[PDB]
Amino acid sequence: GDVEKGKKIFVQKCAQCHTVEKGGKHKTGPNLHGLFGRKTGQAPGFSYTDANKNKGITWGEETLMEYLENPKKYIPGTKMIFAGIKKKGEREDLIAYLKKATNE
Ligand code: HEC
């Protein structure tokens, strides 16, 4: 995907609840640094729902593609309020941005 396009998507749809940078703060949602290769619900010091702690998948390109299409269908009972992104390219750009920014 296109990293700079994904940044614009992140800032528009995600940044109000999430930071990405190393040492970034939790907000409404958890900081996402280190997300890739981490299991669900494992950012330290954040009140996750049991739902998000129990989903039990490893976050990566493919599981984020499925999650971001419809978060509540993938993790029923999640307290993340976000409808999803049905568009494929948008998700791919976003995920490419996240794979850079949450690893930098
Ligand atoms: C506030 C209204 C949010 C919006 C906008 C976005 N996210 Fe979110 N996210 C939010 C919360 C409160 C939580 C915890 C949910 C729970 O049930 O505990 C989350 C969680 C995630 C995760 C899982 C993180 C993990 O398992 O460590 C991811 C990958 C995630 N959120 C990504 C994300 C994306 C990419 C967003 C824009 C498209 C987005 N969220 C918006 C709160 C909010």
Author numbering: 1 to 104
Paper's wording?
In the mitochondrial intermembrane space (IMS), it acts as a single electron carrier from complex III to complex IV, also known as cytochrome c oxidase (COX), as part of the electron transport chain (ETC). Apart from respiration, Cytc plays a key role in intrinsic apoptosis, where its release from the IMS into the cytosol allows Cytc to bind apoptosis protease activating factor-1 (Apaf-1), activating the apoptosome, which in turn activates caspase-9 and the downstream caspase cascade.
Here, we describe the identification and characterization of an acetylation site on lysine 39 (K39) of skeletal muscle Cytc purified from porcine tibialis anterior (TA) skeletal muscle. The crystal structure of porcine K39 acetylated Cytc at 1.50 Å resolution showed an average occupancy of 75% for the acetyl group, suggesting that a large proportion of the protein in the crystal structure is acetylated. The fractional occupancies for the four acetyl groups have an average value of 0.75 ± 0.26 as shown by Phenix.Refine script. The only disordered residues are Lys25-His26 in chains C and D which have broken density for their backbone atoms at 1.0 RMSD and RSCC values ranging from 0.624 to 0.767. The caspase-3 activity of the in vivo K39 acetylated Cytc isolated from ischemic porcine TA muscle decreased caspase-3 activity by 45% compared to the in vivo unacetylated Cytc isolated from control porcine TA muscle.
